[PDB]
Amino acid sequence: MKRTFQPSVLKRNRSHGFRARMATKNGRQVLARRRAKGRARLTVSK
Amino acid sequence: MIREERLLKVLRAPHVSEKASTAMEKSNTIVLKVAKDATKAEIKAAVQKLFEVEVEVVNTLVVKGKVKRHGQRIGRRSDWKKAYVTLKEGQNL
Amino acid sequence: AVVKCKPTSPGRRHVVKVVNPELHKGKPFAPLLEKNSKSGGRNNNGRITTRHIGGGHKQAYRIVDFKRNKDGIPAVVERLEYDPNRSANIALVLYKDGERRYILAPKGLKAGDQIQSGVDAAIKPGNTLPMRNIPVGSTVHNVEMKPGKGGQLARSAGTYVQIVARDGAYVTLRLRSGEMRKVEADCRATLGEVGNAEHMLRVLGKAGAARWRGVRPTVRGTAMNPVDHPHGGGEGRNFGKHPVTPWGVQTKGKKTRSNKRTDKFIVRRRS
RNA sequence: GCUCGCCGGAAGACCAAGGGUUCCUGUCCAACGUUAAUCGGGGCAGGGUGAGUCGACCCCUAAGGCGAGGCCGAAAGGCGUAGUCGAUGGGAAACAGGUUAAUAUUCCUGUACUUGGUGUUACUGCGAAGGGGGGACGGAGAAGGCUAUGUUGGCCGGGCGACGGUUGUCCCGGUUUAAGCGUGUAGGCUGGUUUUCCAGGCAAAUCCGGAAAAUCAAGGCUGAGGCGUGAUGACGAGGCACUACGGUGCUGAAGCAACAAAUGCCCUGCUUCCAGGAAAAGCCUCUAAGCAUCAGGUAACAUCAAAUCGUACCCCAAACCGACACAGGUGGUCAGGUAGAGAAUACCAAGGCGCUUGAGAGAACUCGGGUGAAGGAACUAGGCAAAAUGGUGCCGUAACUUCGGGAGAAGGCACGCUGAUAUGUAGGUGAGGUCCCUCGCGGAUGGAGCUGAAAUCAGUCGAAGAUACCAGCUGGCUGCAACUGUUUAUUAAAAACACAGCACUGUGCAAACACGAAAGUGGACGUAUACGGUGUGACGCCUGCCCGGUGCCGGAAGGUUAAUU
RNA sequence: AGGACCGAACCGACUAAUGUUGAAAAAUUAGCGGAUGACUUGUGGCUGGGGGUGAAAGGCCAAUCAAACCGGGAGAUAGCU
Ligand SMILES: [Mg+2]
Ligand SMILES: [Mg+2]
Ligand SMILES: [Mg+2]
Ligand SMILES: [Mg+2]
Ligand SMILES: [Mg+2]
Ligand SMILES: [Mg+2]
Ligand SMILES: [Mg+2]
Ligand SMILES: [Mg+2]
Ligand SMILES: [Mg+2]
Ligand SMILES: [Mg+2]
Ligand SMILES: [Mg+2]
Ligand SMILES: [Mg+2]
Ligand SMILES: [Mg+2]
Ligand SMILES: [Mg+2]
Ligand SMILES: [Mg+2]
Ligand SMILES: [Mg+2]
Ligand SMILES: [Mg+2]
Ligand SMILES: [Mg+2]
Ligand SMILES: [Mg+2]
Ligand SMILES: [Mg+2]
Ligand SMILES: [Mg+2]
Ligand SMILES: [Mg+2]
Ligand SMILES: [Mg+2]
Ligand SMILES: [Mg+2]
Ligand SMILES: [Mg+2]
Ligand SMILES: [Mg+2]
Ligand SMILES: [Mg+2]
Ligand SMILES: [Mg+2]
Ligand SMILES: [Mg+2]
Ligand SMILES: [Mg+2]
Ligand SMILES: [Mg+2]
Ligand SMILES: [Mg+2]
Ligand SMILES: [Mg+2]
Ligand SMILES: [Mg+2]
Ligand SMILES: [Mg+2]
Ligand SMILES: [Mg+2]
Ligand SMILES: [Mg+2]
Ligand SMILES: [Mg+2]
Ligand SMILES: [Mg+2]
Ligand SMILES: [Mg+2]
Ligand SMILES: [Mg+2]
Ligand SMILES: [Mg+2]
Ligand SMILES: [Mg+2]
Ligand SMILES: [Mg+2]
Ligand SMILES: [Mg+2]
Ligand SMILES: [Mg+2]
Ligand SMILES: [Mg+2]
Ligand SMILES: [Mg+2]
Ligand SMILES: [Mg+2]
Ligand SMILES: [Mg+2]
Ligand SMILES: [Mg+2]
Ligand SMILES: [Mg+2]
Ligand SMILES: [Mg+2]
Ligand SMILES: [Mg+2]
């Protein structure tokens, strides 16, 4: 049975990557939120 | 021309292993741990100057570090560059 | 030529096809082609704005001369061609100076025919003249509505416009819909009717044939639920309401034209 | 190690995605592994991934994204121009052999190829953000020519058989060779060459397009494979000799032909159809402002350069997606033998496995199967399930029908093997010889050799010859839906949805309509033979009466009636 | 020629049995339908929550759908247990 998670590094980076987050005001807000919470990994990039 | 400082820094250590010995004995190729940012030209220049030998060609590859363990503490070794440099059968350095 | 297929399969029984022996069989004239990719009925917001569009055969766009602005230079018909972008056939024409163009092929236009545009052209099918220089009662197509804008009226296969009257700076046309419209007398028109009049006689014969043309199925409002159509709902076949569009406007007789700007140019509605 | 069993269009091999050291070696068995474990994809330590030619990076664009100015919008922002990104597509170049415990088109051996720079020489009108050509494109079908590959014969090496026979018409094994270069073949396309002129290609052009004459009509482009070379090389059964029994070194024969043949190649071709089948650059070419004995260009020779990143390992899976070492899912490539139409099926080759609890016993009952006296649907809601039919060739086949169908209707006969026809027929292929010349990868005759159906006649064995695997049950009456399709991912596949056709109605183009506070966009680079909405639902015969109610359309005399004043 | 026929791959899911603390949060086995087309499939892209998409089942929108998920108003309110 085909499940929901079908990995693709390019689609992952384009949908949730650092540059995609930086592209909009709301993505920058999520980055600021994660920095304030002190997440050790801001995005999916690594 | 590449300066003296760059060539003095690009060579880190001679590599030691069975494959290194086989290559040295057969194809007169020596194996070196070099700088991560060192290109084939810099490696050739540094070997020609600091070792005083003659070089045909340089082969390079990057070795990825191993993800290891130290008492329930994940740790990763660094990446390093490896160079197969062929000396033209006249020195036996 | 209209011919019906033999019923050697259920999908072929009712197929009626329009075959024209005189259309070109090779590839079209390449320097007059463009790419024309499909939209699916989506606008630049990405939303479906016109339903029932999608798929169908890949098509290339042919640049057609609707203006006919090369006055005074004769042109000869080189070949008739198939155009996937419109119901009419088009004709490649060669000008005396070495320039080639596509035009809408009028009825009776065949290879080797001679065409011309300008004020000093003969009253022959395929020739383009300002309507000031076209006799009253003529039959034209590719009719302009503004001078130099290009033809916009009577462009579909078998269509034509009759020049009913003429006075002053305007002429009175009778449109294909049955509407009387006033047009500036300096707008240009091509003599004759548009060709390929047997186009209405084709019978697609099966659903896939309409799918080849890029039209998706229509779902009746009475077959869905009231959350997504005013006609929806019911235990069995139920209607009990006045027919409307999916957005709630009455769809059997209610008029939607509202253009006070162009109302002055309409002598009488199609009725 | 020897037996046995299983897969073999995979349960073998190689890529892409995804994962990340799981790869190799030494060591260890606490925990992990559904048991034990000396073993492991477990722990610990060390080793391992070598590129001018493969891929990325790069040049070029698609869908789409972003977007200087700009237009729009309380703010935030939205759309979009010039631009600039964006592969799943276009664009230069490498093959064979050997080698590691683990890499190899990357290392080595041999032989190649591509693009750019620097110099020398010779000759010479070069030049782009511009023009032209090219790149450049669909479905289906058919033939012909090939190759991969296979079989057989010939040849070389070995053998003479644990039990009757086996010096032969016997048995086993091998019989391999690339890119590149030269030839330019089967075949596909198109008439060449030279002048003079011209409302076109935003300017110009010698280039493209167009007009008119002269002349010759065979020239030009593309092209699998074959042959030669590459290659006296490499590889090679086997033997000789060591081995710490893994493996190491050398020697090393033959290394041909015929036939058969792909879904691969010629072919981005040919024929045909309608639903009419990317873009841009690399490339060739034309000139412009300009430069003008400089630059630039053509060609030969030499030298230099080709950086950086990836490269281990799994990849139908115990390493990816499924919480698991989970009967699930996962795109592409390769494709042997015998039988067979076949990538079905059965048994096998190469190669890979026996699925990480076993040992006994031989109760009821459950699961998966085999057989069954006599009866044959009496079972049951219902023939559910099971049983049965099942191939090829030939004969034969009803009502009805939209004349296609129905139809494989139904039903019936033959089928193995041996010999002869005929020491191998019909056919296919095709050498030597001979003849001709545009002399060659040419042609005409020649038929050796090879391969080889189908049938007829006789004979013969069994209970049975489509003997296994494989492989339609058939017929009659009737409701519904015309038909192929679609649907409740995970209790409903249908009579439901769609459908071709029919009708009503809107819409004159800045269209109606839809998404949008708007700018704009789709409709549509379409124009009433078009587009939207609604109902009905192939086809045949048809579709009767009612406008009082509600809606919609038309009208604007009279009554009423907002802001306003 | 064909939304033609029989039939593998491939795509589906009509029947029965098993399984139901499963090998599996939808499968296995034996049969079954389509199989050149309104086909199927890889890669990438677009549509966003009173919104999308829907050959229309209130189907689907990450094991969630008559209004997704996450965070917030928030200790909503609860004549009820
Ligand atoms: Mg090298
Ligand atoms: Mg519609
Ligand atoms: Mg319809
Ligand atoms: Mg319903
Ligand atoms: Mg409603
Ligand atoms: Mg009712
Ligand atoms: Mg009622
Ligand atoms: Mg590890
Ligand atoms: Mg291992
Ligand atoms: Mg123990
Ligand atoms: Mg244990
Ligand atoms: Mg390990
Ligand atoms: Mg490298
Ligand atoms: Mg763009
Ligand atoms: Mg934008
Ligand atoms: Mg701006
Ligand atoms: Mg770019
Ligand atoms: Mg690509
Ligand atoms: Mg390996
Ligand atoms: Mg061969
Ligand atoms: Mg095929
Ligand atoms: Mg590898
Ligand atoms: Mg297991
Ligand atoms: Mg599994
Ligand atoms: Mg699949
Ligand atoms: Mg099989
Ligand atoms: Mg038992
Ligand atoms: Mg039993
Ligand atoms: Mg039985
Ligand atoms: Mg019995
Ligand atoms: Mg009996
Ligand atoms: Mg009986
Ligand atoms: Mg009974
Ligand atoms: Mg009973
Ligand atoms: Mg049954
Ligand atoms: Mg049975
Ligand atoms: Mg016989
Ligand atoms: Mg009844
Ligand atoms: Mg039906
Ligand atoms: Mg059906
Ligand atoms: Mg269901
Ligand atoms: Mg079902
Ligand atoms: Mg518009
Ligand atoms: Mg209906
Ligand atoms: Mg079919
Ligand atoms: Mg079938
Ligand atoms: Mg389905
Ligand atoms: Mg099944
Ligand atoms: Mg069928
Ligand atoms: Mg309902
Ligand atoms: Mg769901
Ligand atoms: Mg709600
Ligand atoms: Mg509150
Ligand atoms: Mg509370």
From Swiss-Prot, chain A:
GO terms for biological process: cytoplasmic translation. Pfam families: Ribosomal_L34 (PF00468). Keywords: Ribonucleoprotein, Ribosomal protein. One of its GO terms (molecular function) is structural constituent of ribosome. InterPro entries: Ribosomal_bL34, Ribosomal_bL34_CS. GO terms for cellular component: cytoplasm; cytosolic large ribosomal subunit. PROSITE patterns: RIBOSOMAL_L34 (PS00784). The keyword DNA damage does not apply. Belongs to the bacterial ribosomal protein bL34 family. Part of the 50S ribosomal subunit. HAMAP family: Ribosomal_bL34 (MF_00391). NCBIfam families: rpmH_bact. This is Large ribosomal subunit protein bL34. The lineage of its organism: Bacteria, Pseudomonadati, Pseudomonadota, Gammaproteobacteria, Enterobacterales.
UniProtKB/Swiss-Prot annotation, chain B:
Keywords: Ribonucleoprotein, Ribosomal protein, RNA-binding, rRNA-binding. One of its GO terms (biological process) is ribosomal large subunit assembly. One of its GO terms (cellular component) is cytoplasm. The keyword rRNA-binding applies. It holds the Pfam family Ribosomal_L23. GO terms for molecular function: rRNA binding; structural constituent of ribosome. InterPro entries: Nucleotide-bd_a/b_plait_sf (IPR012677), Ribosomal_uL23-like (IPR013025), Ribosomal_uL23/eL15/eS24_sf (IPR012678), Ribosomal_uL23_CS (IPR001014). SUPFAM superfamilies: Ribosomal proteins S24e, L23 and L15e (SSF54189). Gene3D superfamilies: 3.30.70.330. It comes from the Bacteria. The keyword Membrane does not apply. HAMAP family: Ribosomal_uL23_B. Belongs to the universal ribosomal protein uL23 family. One of the early assembly proteins, it binds 23S rRNA; is essential for growth. One of the proteins that surround the polypeptide exit tunnel on the outside of the subunit. Acts as the docking site for trigger factor for Ffh binding to the ribosome (SRP54) and to nascent polypeptide chains. Part of the 50S ribosomal subunit. Contacts protein L29 and trigger factor. Might also contact SecE and probably does contact SecG and SecY when the SecYEG translocation complex is docked with the ribosome. This is Large ribosomal subunit protein uL23.
UniProtKB/Swiss-Prot annotation, chain C:
The modification N6-acetyllysine is found at K241. SUPFAM superfamilies: Nucleic acid-binding proteins, Translation proteins SH3-like domain. GO terms for biological process: cytoplasmic translation; negative regulation of DNA-templated DNA replication initiation; ribosomal large subunit assembly. Gene3D superfamilies: 2.30.30.30, Nucleic acid-binding proteins, Ribosomal protein L2, domain 3. Residues 27-52, 220-271 are annotated as: Disordered. This protein can be partially replaced in vivo by its H.marismortui (HmaL2) or human (L8, from the 60S cytoplasmic ribosome) homolog. Part of the 50S ribosomal subunit. Forms a bridge to the 30S subunit in the 70S ribosome, contacting the 16S rRNA. Interacts weakly with S6 in one of the 3.5 A resolved structures. In pull-down experiments interacts with CedA. One of the primary rRNA binding proteins. Located near the base of the L1 stalk, it is probably also mobile. Required for association of the 30S and 50S subunits to form the 70S ribosome, for tRNA binding and peptide bond formation. It has been suggested to have peptidyltransferase activity; this is highly controversial. HAMAP family: Ribosomal_uL2_B. This is Large ribosomal subunit protein uL2. It comes from Escherichia coli (strain K12). The gene is rplB.
